[PDB]
Each structure stands twice: as C-alpha cells, then as structure tokens.
Amino acid sequence: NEVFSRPEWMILTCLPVPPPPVRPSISFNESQRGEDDLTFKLADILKANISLETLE
Amino acid sequence: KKLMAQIFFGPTYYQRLRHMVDDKIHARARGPMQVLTRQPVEGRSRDGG
Amino acid sequence: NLNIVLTCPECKVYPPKIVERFSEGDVVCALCGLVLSDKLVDTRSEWRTFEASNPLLDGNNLSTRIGKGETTDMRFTKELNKAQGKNVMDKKDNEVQAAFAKITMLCDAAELPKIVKDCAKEAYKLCHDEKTLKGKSMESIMAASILIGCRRAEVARTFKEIQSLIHVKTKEFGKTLNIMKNILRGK
Numbered sequence: 001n002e003v004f005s006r007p008e009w010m011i012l013t014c015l016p017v018p019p020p021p022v023r024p025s026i027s028f029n030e031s032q033r034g035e036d037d038l039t040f041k042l043a044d045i046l047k048a049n050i051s052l053e054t055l056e
Numbered sequence: 057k058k059l060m061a062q063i064f065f066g067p068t069y070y071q072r073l074r075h076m077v078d079d080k081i082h083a084r085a086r087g088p089m090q091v092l093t094r095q096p097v098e099g100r101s102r103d104g105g
Numbered sequence: 106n107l108n109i110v111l112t113c114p115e116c117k118v119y120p121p122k123i124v125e126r127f128s129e130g131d132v133v134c135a136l137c138g139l140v141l142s143d144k145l146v147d148t149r150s151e152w153r154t155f156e157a158s159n160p161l162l163d164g165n166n167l168s169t170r171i172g173k174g175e176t177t178d179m180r181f182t183k184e185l186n187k188a189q190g191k192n193v194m195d196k197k198d199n200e201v202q203a204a205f206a207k208i209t210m211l212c213d214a215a216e217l218p219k220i221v222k223d224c225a226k227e228a229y230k231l232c233h234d235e236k237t238l239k240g241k242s243m244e245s246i247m248a249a250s251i252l253i254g255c256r257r258a259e260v261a262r263t264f265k266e267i268q269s270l271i272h273v274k275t276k277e278f279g280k281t282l283n284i285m286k287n288i289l290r291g292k
C-alpha cells in the first residue's frame with residue numbers, strides 16, 4: 001500500500017515491546033518472581049542485541 | 057389393584073458407579089476471571105464458567 | 106505517587122478488610138456494603154510444570170538446547186551450541202555460575218540436603234560480594250556453605266567430620282568461622 005505496508009518493513013529494524021498485560025507475572029509461593037515466557041525470550045533478544053553492539 | 061401385565065421380578069447384581077450428581081452440580085453467576093484473558097476460569101472446584 | 110486503596114467511599118473507615126468472597130468477588134464492605142471493581146484474579150492458579158521460574162541469583166533465561174524430533178539438529182546443534190558457548194565470554198559470565206555448579210557437585214557427593222543445602226549456597230553468593238577481610242580461598246568459605254548447608258538437619262554432620270574430610274581444617278577454617286558470625290549479626 002506504500003502507506004500501510006512498504007516492503008522495507010517486512011524486515012525488522014525497530015521491534016515493538018508488548019506491555020505487561022500481554023505477558024503477566026505473579027507466582028505460586030509469594031517470595032520470588034514467577035515470570036512469563038515472552039519476557040524470557042525478550043531478555044534473550046536483549047542479550048543477543050547487547051553483545052552485538054559490544055563487538056562493533 | 058392387580059397389574060394387568062405381570063412383571064419380570066427377581067434379584068440382579070448392580071454396581072454403584074462413581075460420579076454422583078452432588079459431585080457435578082456446578083453453577084456460577086459471574087466470579088473469578090483469569091488474569092491473562094479476563095475471561096471466566098475453568099473447573100468447578102475454582103467456581104468457573 | 107502510587108496510592109492503591111479499596112476504601113468503600115460511602116463510609117470511609119481507614120481502613121478494614123472487605124472480604125475476598127467465595128464466588129461473587131468484588132470485596133463488598135460489611136459497612137457501606139457496596140462494590141469495588143470485579144476482582145477476576147485467581148492467585149491459586151499459578152503456572153505448574155504442565156511459565157514460572159524460581160531464580161535465586163539474578164535472573165534465569167536459557168538459550169538453545171534444541172532436541173525436538175522434527176528436523177535433526179546435527180549441523181545446526183553445533184552451530185548454535187558453539188554460538189551460545191562463545192557468548193558466555195562477554196561480561197564476566199563465569200564466577201557465580203561456576204560457583205553454583207561446583208557447589209551442587211560438592212554437596213550432592215556428600216548427599217547434603219537440598220532445602221538447606223541450597224540455602225548456604227545463597228549465603229556464599231552474599232559472601233563472595235562485599236569485601237570484608239575474606240582472604241578468600243574458595244575452599245575456605247565453601248566450608249561455611251558446607252556447615253550452614255548441613256544446618257538443615259544433621260544430614261552429613263556432625264560438621265566437624267566433614268571438616269576432617271578433605272583439605273584445610275585449621276587456620277583457614279578459622280577465617281571462615283568468623284565470616285559466618287559477622288554475616289549473622291549483619292542486619
């Protein structure tokens with residue numbers, strides 16, 4: 001559409017971060033974290049992104 | 057009064073199966089919703105929809 | 106500024122428990138007997154093994170470790186297991202991890218209890234940081250996490266016997282016995 005979809009956007013330059021309601025928390029005990037899966041992979045994305053900026 | 061058709065009458069072994077009605081009469085009318093979906097919860101032990 | 110409250114509104118008491126209810130929810134005051142929101146949050150329903158995580162040191166993530174029988178990893182297993190084995194060199198990754206893995210090996214071998222066996226290993230991670238006359242020997246402060254780890258019950262000790270086991274039972278054990286007394290009196 002040029003307006004809503006340019007081919008240059010099928011490639012991810014800037015990645016949107018989904019808020020806390022998509023990826024909730026709270027646990028089973030009540031003295032520790034109890035996190036979500038998406039968050040984990042987002043942390044993995046960040047580490048992989050930080051170590052890259054490091055080398056360059 | 058007598059019954060116009062005689063009946064098949066005699067002892068027969070019957071087992072009492074589990075799953076009794078009282079163990080199944082779930083009924084909810086708005087209650088605890090899930091965190092992720094804000095949709096009612098599953099199972100009757102949690103009072104679900 | 107974060108203020109969170111359930112005050113009834115109609116007859117402020119400042120403040121009282123409103124009930125969690127059983128089915129209806131919403132915490133209606135036994136005072137104005139009104140409502141507050143809809144609740145809709147089951148805390149009993151935590152993520153089971155069937156996602157939850159109980160981290161004690163920093164934050165656990167994980168990477169790779171592919172094994173799903175769909176397409177064989179072979180070439181790609183080594184592509185990613187090498188690539189993740191390169192990354193655990195960027196910012197002092199080794200230290201805490203090496204300490205906790207070597208920690209679970211020394212305790213498991215003597216069969217130290219997990220509930221309090223792991224408790225003392227948290228104490229070591231608090232003792233490895235902070236700089237108070239450690240004269241750190243690695244093995245030395247490990248005999249502190251071998252004592253408090255056996256503090257669950259007298260699982261293997263008889264702490265003196267586990268001291269008489271292996272190496273360093275003397276002056277270097279003295280430095281360590283002191284460190285524990287200083288850590289206990291530390292609020």
Ligand SMILES: [Zn+2]
Pocket residue numbers: 113114115116117134135136137138139
């Ligand atoms: Zn009230």
